[PDB]
Every structure is written in C-alpha cells, then in structure tokens.
Amino acid sequence: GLNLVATALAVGLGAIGPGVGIGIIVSGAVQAIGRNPEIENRVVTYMFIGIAFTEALAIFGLVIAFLIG
Amino acid sequence: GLNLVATALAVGLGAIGPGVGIGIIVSGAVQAIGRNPEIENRVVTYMFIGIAFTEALAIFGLVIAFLIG
Amino acid sequence: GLNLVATALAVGLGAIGPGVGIGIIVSGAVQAIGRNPEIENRVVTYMFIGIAFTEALAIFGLVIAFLIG
Amino acid sequence: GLNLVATALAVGLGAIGPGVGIGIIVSGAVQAIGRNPEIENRVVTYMFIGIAFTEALAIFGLVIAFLIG
Amino acid sequence: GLNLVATALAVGLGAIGPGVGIGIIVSGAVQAIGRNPEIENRVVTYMFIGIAFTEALAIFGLVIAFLI
Amino acid sequence: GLNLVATALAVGLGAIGPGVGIGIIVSGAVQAIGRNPEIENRVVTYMFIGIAFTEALAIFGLVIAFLIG
Amino acid sequence: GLNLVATALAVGLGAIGPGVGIGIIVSGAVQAIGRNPEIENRVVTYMFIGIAFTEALAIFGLVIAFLIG
Amino acid sequence: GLNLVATALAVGLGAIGPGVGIGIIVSGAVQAIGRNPEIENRVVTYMFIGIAFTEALAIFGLVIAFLIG
Amino acid sequence: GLNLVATALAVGLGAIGPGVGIGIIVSGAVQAIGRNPEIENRVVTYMFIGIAFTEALAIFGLVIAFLIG
Amino acid sequence: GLNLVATALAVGLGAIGPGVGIGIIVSGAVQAIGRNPEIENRVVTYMFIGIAFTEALAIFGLVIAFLIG
Amino acid sequence: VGALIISIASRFFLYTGPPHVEVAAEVIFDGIPGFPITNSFVVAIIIDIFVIALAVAATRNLQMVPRGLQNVMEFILESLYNLFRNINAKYVATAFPLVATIFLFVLFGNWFGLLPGVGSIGVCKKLVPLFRAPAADLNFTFAIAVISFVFIEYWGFRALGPGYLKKFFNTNGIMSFVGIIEFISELVKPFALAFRLFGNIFAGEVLLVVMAFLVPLLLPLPFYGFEVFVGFIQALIFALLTYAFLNIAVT
Amino acid sequence: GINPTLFIAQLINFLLLIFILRALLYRPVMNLLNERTRRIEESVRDAEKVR
Amino acid sequence: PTLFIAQLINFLLLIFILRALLYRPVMNLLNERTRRIEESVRDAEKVR
Amino acid sequence: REVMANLTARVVGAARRGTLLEKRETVKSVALLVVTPDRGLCGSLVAN
C-alpha cells in the first residue's frame, strides 16, 4: 500500500505552502485596503490572480494524488 | 499498517499551512480594522474568503486522509 | 506498533500549524487593541472567530489521530 | 521500539507550533505594552487567554505521548 | 511503488516554497500599489517578471513529476 | 538502535519551537525597550514569563529524552 | 526506484529556498519602488542579482537531480 | 548505523530553531540600537541572555548527539 | 542507491536555507536603498558580505553532496 | 551505507536554520544602518558576532557530518 | 449557575453503544427503474420543495410593509445585492439569480445535513443511510461548478470580446508565459470549488458522526454550532467566489 | 462510481430548482427590492419637489 | 441505537444553547430590523 | 519652516504630493485672507 502514502505525502506537502501563500496574499490586500481605501477596484484583481495561481499550485498536487489513487 | 501512516500524514501534512494562513489573515484583518474601523464591514468579507481558502486546503487534506483510511 | 507512530505524526503535524495560527491571531489582536482600545468588541469577536477556526483544525487533527489510537 | 519513536514524535512534534505561537503572543503583547502601558491588564488577560489556548494543544500532545508510553 | 511516492514528494516540495514566493510577491505588489497606485504600470510588470521566475521552479517540479 | 533515533527525534524536535519562540520574545522585548525604556521592568518580567513557558516546553522533551536514554 | 525518489527529492527540496528567496526579493524591491520610483534601475539591478543567486542555487539543485536521474 | 542517523537528526533539528531564534534576537537588538544607542548597555544584556538560552538548547542537542556517537 | 537519496537530501536542504537568507538580505538591502539611496555603496558592501556568508552554507552542502555523489 | 544518508541529513539540516538567521541579521542590520548611518560602527560590531553565533550551529552540523563521513 | 459544571451526563456509553464509524462517500437509494435516485438526490428534492414553500409564504400577500418572513428574506437578498455591488455594479442583475440560488440552496443543504436523523435513519441486508446532504455528493457539487464555469465563460465571451489574448496567447514579453498559467488556473477553478464544497460538508458529516460515536453526549455541542458556521461560510463564499471570478473575467 | 447520466440528472434537478424558485420568489423579490429602492427614490424626489 | 437519542438531545441542546446565546439577539436582528423598516417607511408616509 | 522644507524634499512624487501639498491645475475658486485693525486711527494702513 505504498501508493496510499504517496497520495498522502502529495496532498499534505502540496498545501502547506499554498496556504501560507494565500494567507500572505489576502493579508497584504486587507492591510493595503485599510491604508488606502480609495484604491480597491484593481488591487483585488492582482490579489485574485495570485490566489488563482496559488490554488492551481495546490490543485496540481491534489490532481497528482488523485491520479495515483 | 502503512495505510494508518498514510492517513496520518495526509491530515497532518496539509494542515500546517492552513493554520498559519488563518493566523496571518486574522492578524492582517484585525490590524486593518484597528487602523481603519469603518471599512471593517467591507473587508471582513475578504478576511473570511482567505480564511475559507486556507480551510479549503485543510479540508482537501482531511478528505484525502479519510479516503485513505 | 505502526499505529503508534501514525498517531504521533498525525497529532504533531496537525498541532504545529494551529499553534502558530493562534499565536499570530492573538499577536495581531493585542497589537490592534493597543493601537486603539476604543474599538474592542468588534475586534475580539473576529479574534475569537479565528481562534475557533484554528482550534477546529487542531481538533480535526486530534480526532483523526484518536481514530487510529 | 516504534512506541518509543511515537512518544518522541508526539512530544517533539506538536510542540513546535506551541513553541512559536507562544513566542509570537508574548512578542505582540510586549510590543503593545510598550505602545500602551495603561492597557496592561486587558492585554495581559488576552495574552493569558492565548497562552492557555496554546498550552491546551501542548498538553494534548503531551498526554497523547504519555498514553503512547 | 517508489515512483509514486517520488512524484508525490516532487510535486509537494515544489509547491511548498514557490507558493510562499507567489504570496510574498503579491503581498509586496499590493502594498506598493496601496502606497503608490501611480507606479502601477511598472510595478505590475516587475511583479510579472518576478512571478514567472517564481513559477519556473514549480513548472520544473511538475515536469519532473510527469516524467516519472 | 531505534530508541537512539527516538531520543534524537525527541531532543531535536523539542527545541525547534522553543528556540524560535524565545528568539521572537527577546526581539520583541528589546524592540519595545528601545522604543520605550521606562517600561523595561514590566517588559523584562513578561519576557521572563514567556521564556520560562518555552523553556518548560523544551524540558518536556528533554526529560523524555533522558528517560529513553 | 530509489534513484527516482532521490531525483524527485532533489528537485522538490531544491525549489523551496530559492522560491521563497525570489519572492522576498521581489516583494522588497517592489515595496522600495513604491516608496522610491527614482531609484528604479539601481534597485532593479540588485533585485536581479539576488534573483540570479537564487536561480543559480535552484539550477544546482536541478542539475544534481538530472545527474542522479 | 541507526546511531549515526540519530546523531545527524539530533544535530540538525536541534540547530534549525536556535539559529532562527538567534537571528531574530540579533535583528531586534540591532533595530533597537538603531532606534536608540544609549540603551545599548541595557539591551545587550538581554540580547546575550536570549542568545545564551538558544545556544544552550543547541548545545544540549549537540551534546546528546555526541553521547549517542 | 542510498548515496543518491543522500546527495538529493543534502542538496535540497542546503538550498532551502541559504535561498531564504539571501532573499531576506536582498529585500532588506533594497528597502534601505529606497529609504536612503545616498549610502547605496555602503549598505551594498554589507549586502554582498552577507550574501557571501549565506551562500557559504549552500556551498558546504553542495560540496558534501558532490562528495557523496 | 546508512552513514552516507546520516552525514547528508546532518549537513542538510544544519543549514536550513542558520541561513535564515544570518539573513535576518543582515537585513535588520542594513535597515538599522539605513535609519542611522553614523551608528554603523556599533551596528556592525554586533552584526558580526551575531552572524558568528548563528553560523556556529551550521559549523557544528558540518563537523558532525565530517565525523560521520 | 455558579460552578455546576459536572458533566455527569457526558459519561454515558462512551463508545459501547454507537457504531465505530459507519460512513460512506456515496450511496444509492434507487427505488425506480432507469435512473438510480440517491438519498442525496432526495435531500436535494426535499430542500427544493421546502425553499419553494418558504418562498410562497414569503411572497404570500406581498405588502408595502415588510414583516416576519418577508422582512428576513428581503434582508438576505438586499444584503447580498449590496455585497455583490461592492465588487461589481455592472453585471449584478445578470448573475444575481444564479448566485442567490446557489448560495441559498447550499446554505439550506448544509443546514439540513446537520439535522438529527441524517445518519440515524436508513433503510435496510446492510443499512444504507438516508437523508444525505446534497453537498456530500460529488454529482451535485460538480454540477454547480460546471454550471458556474459555463456561466462565467459565456459572460466573458459576451463581454470584452472573444479575444482572451491575455490568457490564450501573446506575441512578445512574459505575457506568453503568464497566459498559459491563467488558462490552467481558470480550468482548475471549477474543480477546486466543487472539491471545496463537497469536502467541507462531507468531512463535517463524518466528524459529527464520529464524535457521536465517542462520548456522544454534551461534547459535540460547540462543534455542531461550528459546523453550522462552516456550512454558512461555505454557502456564502461559493457565491462570492463565483461573482468575483465573473468580475475578474470581465476585467 | 460517478455516472454521467446521474450527473446530467443532477443538472436537471438544479434546473428545476433554479427555474421554479426564481420564478416563484426572486422576480417577486426583485419587485420587492425595486419597491423599497424606487419608493425611497419617490420619497426623495417628492421631498425636494415639496420644498 | 444510542446515536438516535444522542443526536436528538445534542441537537435539542444545540437549539437551546442557540436560544440562550441568540434569543434577544435573534430579536436584535428581527424586531430591531422591522423597527428600522417602519422608521424608513414613516418618512414617505409623511411626504405624501 | 525647515521641518516642512525637509519633509517636502522627500515627498517629491506627484502621486504622494496630495491633500494640502497638491499643486492643483485649473484653478476655479480662490480664497483670500485679510487682517485689519479692529479700530481706526491707523492712517492709510486700513485703506492700503
């Protein structure tokens, strides 16, 4: 049953990084909005593309684990 | 019992990043509202969005661990 | 006896994250409160929400560990 | 022997988060104290709340190790 | 099944650090925009050249994962 | 030789968290003292309290390592 | 498959430190640009120097992995 | 050879924490010095106390590794 | 093939730390330069020596990795 | 061949922390010098000893790796 | 109150009574030829008719003066409308029906998944459980995800032209490298949302069941309330992320 | 096992759901939100008109 | 089985603790809301 | 005076030269402050 450990390691190690990344993203976004309330329309765009790339990074490992499953 | 270690790692690993991300988001949002009280009603939404992204990564780890178990 | 190390790994790797998460939550909350103690309840509410979410992830790790235990 | 390794991991791992969260809590609390001395009782109470929350996970890991022992 | 755990470790450890890199990049970009929206045209380009380099290592990890 | 590896894991893993916690504590306390020297007594007392907490959490692993060894 | 897991471990671990380093480099350079557009090329040169150092470390990891595989 | 792996793990894991702790201590102390140099004689003492604590943890790990060796 | 995974682990772990260190160094240096372009050469000298010291550990790890490989 | 992986692990885990610590030291020192140019004389004299303390852990790791080898 | 925390009731049949786990990823109820209707499908149907009845009661004799059910329904709808206007104000009404129905149905399904009887009531022979949360079925979460993906793709083709050069292909610069990653992330988005909702409800069901296995009494009181919060937050964020993806695709 | 026919059946269920709930509630409730907004707007215009 | 009564009384106590924490707060989000609503409607009652 | 000179030396970008420091274009309204004696007998000063 080594494939079970393989999937476990894939999913576990493909999320510890992206979670901190998303946290840093939206924390910086919230701080910037609080400092500069006027500029919100376009900064959220960069926040969300960063979120999308980080989520894609995590889902790469998730999909690899599902393939192994 | 390799399946036991597999499901232990799938949940253990993959939840480290979500916790730190939740903490970073909470700290950033709290600081932002402390500096900018009136935008709290608008920025708590993005705070919860980031928190739920992190919890979503954690939940991916959890469900994969349950499937392995 | 691999169940023992599986449980230990689950507990450890599910607890290291939430500790840092709650630590950042409390640090941000106390910093913001010190910056302006005028607004207190509308900050402590989100502080406790973050603490509850992080402790919920910790208890997820705890219960999945106890399943093997 | 696994039992001993599991005890070491349960004591060892699961205390890193409750080794850094407490430190971040205390650093934030002393920073707020230096920034605001007259709010000492409130910030110390919330610091103790955070310390108790972190020590909860620490004691959970320790008692799990004792059970593994 | 050492190939399976190999691919797993490759993808996971290639997602560990580059994810944090993406996050720090975007946080810095948002901070700069909040402090100075008028430098957007150049700062977003700097962010993009940075984010491509940061994602390059993740792309390498995925390539090695697919090769295995 | 597995119990020796268990002792190594207990000692090494039991200091990762407390070391960083003590470091963050001392950094925050010293930065606050530089910001405000007159709050040095209270900052040093809370610094000692936090360092004692982290040291006790390190001793939790140290005693287990001694028992195994 | 120990060669395969060795190659994978080399690539995966070698991508962590350089990735976080590039991220911190770009964040610091971007924040400096936001605070000072007039030193743009001068700080961009150092940003590229740091990125080149991190990329050189990553290339060392990748080429070691290629040699192993 | 498990003794060799035990020494390696002990020396490694008992240095990663104290190293970051010492780094944080020195960064905070230097920042406080930059804020105020005249508080050097007072902040350097606690800086050395923190450095001594972290180095004591590291030396404990190294000595246990030497005993295993 | 234990030598292969040993080499891989050595290179990866020797790249993990120095990358982050170099990144923090360059971020701080560029931040200072943006704050104070007038002492650019003075701070950049310290930046280069710090980068060399950080790269020293990467070189050590890569050297041991080559020796094993 | 477990000695090979043992020494590789020792040299690897002896670097991930001290590199980050030295990087934090240099970043803080450069920032402090940017804030205060003329106090570089007393900033650098502490920065070097801090770097030496942080690198002592890495040197312990390397000498132990040599002994294992 | 004082110090009456005794927890005497908690120490009642810690693990002797209830079954160990008794959980499943997907179950089938069937009952008719052709389509094997599932119990999750049954909960979808009952929540559908329940929200229909609640709606008709809300729309029963609409008055200029809100009161009771009408007042709270208007509260939820107008709060959601303002929240979506806070992100984008040009494509609110277009996506408002889909967004609102997704949010409300997901919320009510998550809340019904926590009612007693969900894991207890089951037809026989093995005991296949009845009353399964609709989000616990991948067939439903993937359906919502693909519906949202079709909606966002159609509206992003309708507005801003069918170009998509930012994500399809670029001539020079790093935008060529950026465009492919944007396409990959866009493809990832529906699967990510589906797995998010499905897991965040199914894991909650598993946790409440297995906590009902061990010390069944008085311990899961906060976790049930937390699970209510988890379901509500999931229902809200699904809609919010759908609208945010729509807006960024418009941009 | 996920069945594409059952997947499409979930799509038909959600189609019934969205269409019937929308027609029976949301257009009445869009009339309600328009009622409050349009009525406040009537109040405002009549306010400056009466002064 | 025990799960039936366990879920029954745990959910009834969930509703009861929800009542304890949010009876006057459910009133805060319903009764005070309709007070806000009638405050809003009185203005254009007067304006006619 | 020299504090303001030092501060505006650093704040040189137009984006951050906002609020009171902004050099507005297309001037439309201008306010003038006049300080005068409260009492007469000042000679031509008030008239000037």
Automatic annotation (TrEMBL), chain K:
- InterPro entries listed in its UniProt record: ATP_syn_F0_a_bact/chloroplast, ATP_synth_F0_asu, ATP_synth_F0_asu_AS, F0_ATP_A_sf
Extract the GO molecular function terms from the UniProt entry: proton-transporting ATP synthase activity, rotational mechanism
**Positions of transmembrane segments:** 1-15, 35-57, 91-112, 138-156, 197-219, 226-246
The alphabetical list of record keywords is: ATP synthesis, Cell membrane, CF(0), Hydrogen ion transport, Ion transport, Membrane, Transmembrane, Transmembrane helix, Transport
PROSITE patterns, per the entry:
ATPASE_A
**Pfam families linked to this entry:** ATP-synt_A (PF00119)
Primary location: membrane
Q: How does it sit in the membrane?
A: Multi-pass membrane protein
- UniProt subcellular location: Cell membrane; Membrane
Coiled-coil region(s) = none
Single biological process term from Gene Ontology: proton motive force-driven plasma membrane ATP synthesis
Q: Which domain of life is it from?
A: Bacteria
Q: A Gene Ontology CC term for this entry?
A: plasma membrane
**Does Amino-acid biosynthesis appear among the keywords?**
no
According to its UniProt entry, the function of this protein is described as: Key component of the proton channel; it plays a direct role in the translocation of protons across the membrane.
HAMAP family assigned: ATP_synth_a_bact
What is the protein's quaternary organization? F-type ATPases have 2 components, CF(1) - the catalytic core - and CF(0) - the membrane proton channel. CF(1) has five subunits: alpha(3), beta(3), gamma(1), delta(1), epsilon(1). CF(0) has three main subunits: a(1), b(2) and c(9-12). The alpha and beta chains form an alternating ring which encloses part of the gamma chain. CF(1) is attached to CF(0) by a central stalk formed by the gamma and epsilon chains, while a peripheral stalk is formed by the delta and b chains. F-type ATPases have 2 components, CF(1) - the catalytic core - and CF(0) - the membrane proton channel. CF(1) has five subunits: alpha(3), beta(3), gamma(1), delta(1), epsilon(1). CF(0) has four main subunits: a, b, b' and c.
Entry similarity comment? Belongs to the ATPase A chain family.
| Protein name (record) | ATP synthase subunit a
Q: Organism, per UniProt?
A: Chloroflexus aurantiacus (strain ATCC 29366 / DSM 635 / J-10-fl)
Q: What is the lineage of its organism?
A: Bacteria, Bacillati, Chloroflexota, Chloroflexia, Chloroflexales
